[PDB]
Design a binder for these strands. Structure first.
Lengths: 267, 385, 127, 123, 173, 125
RNA sequence: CGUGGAGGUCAGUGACGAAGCCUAGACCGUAAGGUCGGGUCGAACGGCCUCUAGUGCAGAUCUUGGUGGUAGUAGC
RNA sequence: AUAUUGGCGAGAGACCGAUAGCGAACAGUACAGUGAUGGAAAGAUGAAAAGAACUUUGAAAAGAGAGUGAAAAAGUACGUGAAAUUGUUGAAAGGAAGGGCAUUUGAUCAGACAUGGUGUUUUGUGCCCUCUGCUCCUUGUGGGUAGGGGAUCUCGCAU
């Protein structure tokens, strides 16, 4: 009977809430006189957050990433039949990347041909944005020598301050895992490597589970040993994909839809 | 058991000592007894091929173009023991990148194509080994009375060369091939100073679209000579090869130059390679080098790996028997090799050393090495007390 | 932005829907501390809550009333939101009620659901 | 092809379809004799009639000049091989994305125009 | 006979007919030159018929005669079309000698269309299109949208940035 | 197709009978196939399951798990397997309900009644 | 034109998402309506020849269920 | 042999589908009438409760974190959530509004992974030339399939 079931549980929940509130009040009142008991109870009760329940080379860096000895030239292009949104995103790419050259897609020069031309021009990396609708959906980065590349999915693209001409400071967070630090190294070698702290410009990459948040802010310190920050325009989140490890050959970590069931391990 | 793992990133040989059931991904799971690097030379001169002459002496080859003889020693360190490696002699300057560089143009897609050791196995008792390179240079190395390696000859094969396999089934002949290079049978003079091109493969007829079928045999394994009728003029050799385009081709010199049957293993011509003959029940039906000890293709079963993540199992008719490490291999398996018919060595870009059971496909050992894996060899299957 | 805002909700309350809506409108957009002080003064009858939709005194210059019953629940919800922000470690001074809404609850008296959100004001910006 | 002259582009709406919510927008003829719409007094909504008939030479042709033809599978798609110019393949809304890519590939191979390509697909 | 069969398939629910919104009755039968289920076009309504079909790359001229109506297992004969276009057209004309002009014209049109359909080879030759059509399931979309929001909420990027900046400039200036 | 006039193929009647079947009938309902190795041994396809019977998981998220059964929930048409348990947020362990039709018996528990049933069903021991 | 059900046919559609719903989206028809683009949804539904009827709503001081001004008003 | 809307027990429906079907799918129960009598409303969580451990604000309602769960846009008010109606943000407009013909302005949506076709010139191939074969019918203006030799070669394809 629906009425019986609804009535029985409705009263049960009220009594449970009353008991919970009374117990909490009594516990707080008794702990006020016994502060140590509160500490013991807190120690005996862990919040069991998802983060707390996670389920468990210099030659490589130089060889597969740019170094300060030579600034990296990054080749920027767009997938064929691109439209206004792609160029609008490329504008931000120019505004944020150090040394970019924009070339229209020639529609027939194979990836091998593009790589050969870039080698002829001494380019360092290739970045290409791809679109399906009038929106950016994915971004790719490839290094010329030895062809280490990464493919990133793009979501939640949102256009409040005006960035200055100063090079923002680079900060990376939560890249402890071996796979994560590879993307961290890619970002550290693709973005400018020469800070100009004067001007208080900062660029931050923050991964939490699998998505990395890229944002820009102005940071000003106060006497309270704390720093306030203000949004500097665009919002950006990316998802690593296909981990090719080559130009297109020998994929190493390519994601599959069958994953994410474990709810953990935060690749 | 004891295993040696080649680490391309660190350019060192890693000795893995662990029992069956080892899993480094779980703290409570059995952990390897010892895993340390040996003879580190960096990613610039990483080991490319390895062959275990014996449990005390081994010969290693590096992508730098140098083959080094390694002396193995043991010292004690529960109650198990670990090995140490010392290099006694080496031969260098075997690579010639000019040939590969001249062939870089018109290739599907790749870099300058730096040369590398494709095969390294004894020619014969005589401590004579043949070294093959992607540039097509075939070098002969013999162990002298003083144990120092000496180069006897430097033969030349049609480049590019992707594989080389000797015909050890007496019942010296070997076959090689590469990108847009049909398989050619080569006979070696007893003095190793000359090579004769006895037979060459032929491409199959065009497909529905009339497009020429590309030729790119990645691996080859020989079978016993065809029994019964043996017409003269034609040779008597049986072998099968796996191409990048997923086409499983079986060759019979008695039948003719063209393969008698071609089977598409995967749709869309999925990149396939590493054709290793294996027994469905784990029997050692493969010769010392790996050739199948049979004269029929119906009993042939081969393990092949795609370039994305999977390790495929195929029979003699191209039927997929299943997958190995489907839910555990997250990356391309750069190296796969059947050991003793029952153990399947697995390694690649995932940085995890895996040992699978051919009988049941169960994952027996899982060891994390950090660096990428390109070659694995097992020294002993004994379990540490 | 959830990282800079806190929320507090009260459902199935028995306060009059019209009076609660008027109180919420009279308090929408005010600073948290200023809103609390205004509610406290209203409880003291020093200031009146305007009734602009569901309806003459000098207090209405800033047509007004003193819905003490509704104001009690409004200030309780504001205190709950402040506690939530403190748990989130937000700056109470910069907090201001950016969103406040009243929704009719299932039917007798006319209960309603009240939810409010507080956001930190942006400041301390320079080249 | 002949110009696609649309005699009445505006969608016909039932009288008082917006004054009362209980009246659906679907057209329905007024039956009352006193109804002004039935007598088509000046200023009232236009009443559908035989005059607005579209010409046969352009009837059912989309602005692109290709007639719509629902396609359920490759077998249905292959029927438009001899009528690619006059007919275009339209994928049904119930077709799963799994078969949509295959259908689009065959349409491109045969050169059949697709009215709603890329539906449910991502690049 | 043909007339009885024709009228029965026309007015008595031919199984392979398709009704387009425009009002044209189509014909998905594989053995028809035209996909329209009109007279002298549907193979079932005509004893004599001719059509072009292909299984492999080779194109074949398929035709049937009353000699094989009683034996459906051998109803249709085929001949290699000599895929050279100029030779193929003359071969088709010679094979269809004395046949109705409608059949000859339809067969020639079908053969020409099938020959020019080889554009698939052109696109196959011009491969390496990197768009890589990908289908997104509703369940997959839900996972990313909600879990991304949860990760953003839990991350608290501003606090982490402030902590990193404080720890960096403590001994970095 | 059914030929007997005394048996009805009505969906409603069958559904009512299945849900209202008594525990005695539910015992027959909760049958589990024997392993291929055991089938050759005893020459029997399936037998009713019981507490001490050891079963293997062939379907569901717990595929490949095995353990001794601990309870046969006839009311819920489910059976429990030792070591196959869920982990709640509070740490309490609750056995996961499994259907016998999705499990394979690996080791039967032998009693006089079970031995008699094996002989009755054409088996051998 | 549209709907409940039935005979036949699409070796039909569909967990890689069927029906329904929403949609300042588009296409088709003179219209009953059909179709496709995007969001929730979850497991059945449809292209066509016939048969069948408890088959189509704007009102009947129409029935059930739900919600507004009256009104925070009369009043307590 | 004949009737059978009661009883027991069975096989079925071109029948209806929680405002239908018996009034009752969870009832002749609650309920109203001194009484004979009348007489309802109410189905579905989730695979399984795995039913929100734990921290935190509240005398009390339930909130905020946190997590379980395919999904909580399934939280026992639980398979899906439209109108009438109500509150917030934004746009617009102001003793009325509503619709039709034509258009400006504001906002906003579509707007070809079309990248071809033709004749000519190198080179490599095959179903192309030549030699030697096998195979299905019937017998035919055929089909299928092999082993040796080359670029007389544009018969097609790729450059």
């Amino acid at each position: 009977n629906k009425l019986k079931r609804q009535e029985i549980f409705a009263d049960i929940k009220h009594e449970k809430n009353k008991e919970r509130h009374t117990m909490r009040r009594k516990r707080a009142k008794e702990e006020r006189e016994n502060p140590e008991l509160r500490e013991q109870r807190l120690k005996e009760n862990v919040t069991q957050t998802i983060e707390n329940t996670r389920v468990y080379e210099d030659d490589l860096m130089r060889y597969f990433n740019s170094n300060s000895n030579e600034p990296p030239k990054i080749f920027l292009t767009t997938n064929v039949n691109a439209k206004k949104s792609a160029y609008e995103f490329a504008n931000i790419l120019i505004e944020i990347l150090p040394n970019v050259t924009f070339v229209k897609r020639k529609f027939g020069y194979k990836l091998k041909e593009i790589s050969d031309i870039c080698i002829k021009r001494n380019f360092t990396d290739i970045v290409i944005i791809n679109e399906d609708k009038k929106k950016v959906t994915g971004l790719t980065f490839i290094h010329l020598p030895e062809g280490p590349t990464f493919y990133f999915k793009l979501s939640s693209f949102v256009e409040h301050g005006r960035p200055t001409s100063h090079i923002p400071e680079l900060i990376l967070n939560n890249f402890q895992t071996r796979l994560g630090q590879t993307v961290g190294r890619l970002f550290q070698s693709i973005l400018p490597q020469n800070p100009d702290i004067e001007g208080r410009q900062v660029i931050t990459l923050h991964n939490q589970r699998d998505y990395i948040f890229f944002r820009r802010h102005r940071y000003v310190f106060k006497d309270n040993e704390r720093v306030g920050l203000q949004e500097l325009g665009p919002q950006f989140t990316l998802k690593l994909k296909r981990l090719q490890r080559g130009i297109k050959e020998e994929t190493e970590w390519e994601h599959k839809p069958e994953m994410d069931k474990e709810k953990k391990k935060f690749y | 058991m004891r295993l040696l793992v080649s680490c391309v990133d660190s350019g060192s040989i890693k000795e893995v000592l662990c029992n069956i059931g080892t899993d480094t991904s779980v703290q409570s799971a059995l952990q390897p007894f010892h895993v340390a690097p040996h003879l580190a030379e960096g990613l610039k001169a990483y080991v490319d091929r390895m062959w275990v002459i014996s449990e005390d002496e081994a010969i290693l080859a590096r992508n730098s173009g140098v083959v080094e003889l390694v002396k193995i020693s043991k010292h004690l360190k529960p109650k198990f023991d670990i090995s140490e490696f010392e290099i006694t002699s080496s031969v260098s300057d075997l690579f010639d990148d000019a040939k590969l560089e001249s062939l870089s143009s018109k290739s599907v897609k790749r870099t300058k194509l730096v040369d590398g050791f494709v095969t390294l196995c004894p020619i014969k008792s005589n401590n004579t080994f043949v070294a093959a390179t992607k540039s097509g240079l075939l070098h002969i190395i013999k162990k002298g009375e003083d144990k120092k390696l000496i180069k006897l000859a430097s033969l030349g094969l049609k480049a590019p060369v992707e594989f080389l396999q000797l015909y050890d089934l007496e019942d010296y002949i070997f076959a090689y091939g590469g990108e847009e290079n049909l398989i050619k049978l080569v006979e070696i003079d007893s003095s190793f100073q000359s090579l004769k091109q006895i037979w060459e493969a032929k491409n199959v007829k065009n497909d529905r679209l009339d497009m020429r079928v590309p030729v790119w045999p990645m691996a080859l394994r020989f079978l016993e000579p065809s029994p019964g009728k043996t017409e003269k003029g034609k040779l008597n050799y049986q072998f099968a090869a796996i191409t990048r385009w997923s086409h499983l081709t079986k060759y019979s010199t008695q039948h003719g130059r063209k393969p008698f049957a071609q089977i598409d293993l995967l749709p869309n011509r999925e990149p396939l390679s590493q054709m290793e003959v294996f027994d469905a029940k784990g029997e050692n039906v493969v010769s010392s080098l790996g050739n199948f000890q049979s004269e029929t293709f119906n009993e042939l079963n081969v393990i092949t790996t795609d370039y994305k993540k999977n390790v495929f199992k195929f029979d003699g008719n191209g039927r997929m028997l299943g997958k190995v490490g489907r839910d555990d291999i997250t990356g391309s398996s750069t190296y796969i090799h059947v050991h003793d018919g029952k153990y399947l060595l697995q390694g690649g870009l995932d940085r995890y050393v895996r040992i699978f059971d051919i009988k049941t496909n169960k994952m027996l050992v899982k060891v994390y090495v950090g660096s990428r894996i390109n070659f694995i060899v097992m020294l002993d299957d004994v379990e540490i007390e | 932005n959830p990282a800079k805002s806190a929320s507090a909700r009260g459902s199935y309350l028995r306060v009059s829907f019209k009076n609660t809506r008027e109180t919420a409108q009279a308090i929408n957009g005010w600073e948290l501390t200023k809103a609390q002080k205004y509610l406290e003064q209203v409880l003291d009858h020093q200031r009146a809550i305007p009734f602009r939709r569901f309806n003459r005194t000098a207090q209405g210059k800033e047509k007004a009333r003193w819905p003490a019953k509704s104001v009690k629940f409004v200030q309780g919800l504001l205190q709950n939101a402040a506690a939530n922000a403190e748990a989130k470690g937000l700056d109470a001074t910069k907090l201001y009620v950016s969103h406040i809404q009243v929704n009719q609850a299932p039917k007798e008296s006319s209960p309603s659901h009240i939810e409010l959100v507080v956001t930190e004001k942006e400041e301390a910006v320079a080249k | 092809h002949p110009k696609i002259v649309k005699k009445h582009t505006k969608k016909f709406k039932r009288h008082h379809s917006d004054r009362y919510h209980r009246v659906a927008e679907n057209w329905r003829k007024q039956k009352g004799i006193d109804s002004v719409v039935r007598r088509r007094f000046r200023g009232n909504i236009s009443q559908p009639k035989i005059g607005y008939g579209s010409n046969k030479k352009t009837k059912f042709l989309s602005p692109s000049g290709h007639k719509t033809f629902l396609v359920a599978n490759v077998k249905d798609l292959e029927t438009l091989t001899m009528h690619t110019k006059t007919y275009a393949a339209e994928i049904a809304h119930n077709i799963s994305a799994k078969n949509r890519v295959v259908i689009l590939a065959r349409a491109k191979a045969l050169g059949i125009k697709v009215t709603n390509p890329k539906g449910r697909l991502a690049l | 006979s043909d007339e009885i069969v024709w009228q029965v398939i026309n007015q008595s629910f031919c199984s392979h007919r398709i009704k387009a919104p425009n009002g044209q009755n189509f014909c998905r039968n594989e053995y028809n030159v035209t996909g329209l289920c009109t007279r002298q076009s549907c193979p079932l309504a005509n004893s004599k018929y001719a059509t072009v079909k292909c299984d492999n790359g080779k194109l074949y001229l398929y035709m049937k005669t009353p000699e094989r109506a009683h034996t459906p297992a051998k109803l249709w004969e085929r001949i290699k079309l000599s895929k050279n276009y100029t030779k193929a057209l003359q071969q088709i004309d010679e094979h269809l000698l004395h046949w109705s002009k409608f059949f000859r014209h339809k067969c020639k049109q079908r053969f020409t269309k099938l020959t020019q359909v080889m554009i698939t080879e052109r696109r196959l030759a011009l491969r390496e299109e990197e768009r890589h059509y990908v289908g997104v399931a509703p369940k997959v979309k839900r996972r990313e949208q909600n879990r991304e929001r949860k990760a953003l909420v839990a991350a608290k990027i501003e606090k982490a940035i402030e902590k990193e900046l404080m720890d960096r400039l403590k001994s970095g200036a | 197709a059914k030929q007997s006039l005394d048996v009805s193929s009505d969906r409603r009647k069958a559904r009512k009978a299945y849900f209202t079947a008594p525990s005695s009938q539910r015992r027959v309902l909760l049958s589990a196939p024997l392993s291929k190795e055991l089938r050759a041994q005893y020459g029997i396809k399936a037998l009713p399951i019981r507490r001490d019977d050891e079963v293997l998981v062939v379907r569901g998220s717990k595929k490949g798990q095995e353990g001794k059964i601990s309870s046969v929930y006839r009311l819920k048409f489910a059976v429990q397997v030792d070591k196959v348990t869920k982990e709640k947020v509070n740490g309490a362990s609750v056995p996961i309900n499994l259907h016998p039709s999705k499990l394979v018996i690996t080791k039967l528990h032998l009693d006089k009644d079970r031995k008699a049933l094996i002989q009755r069903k054409g088996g051998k021991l």
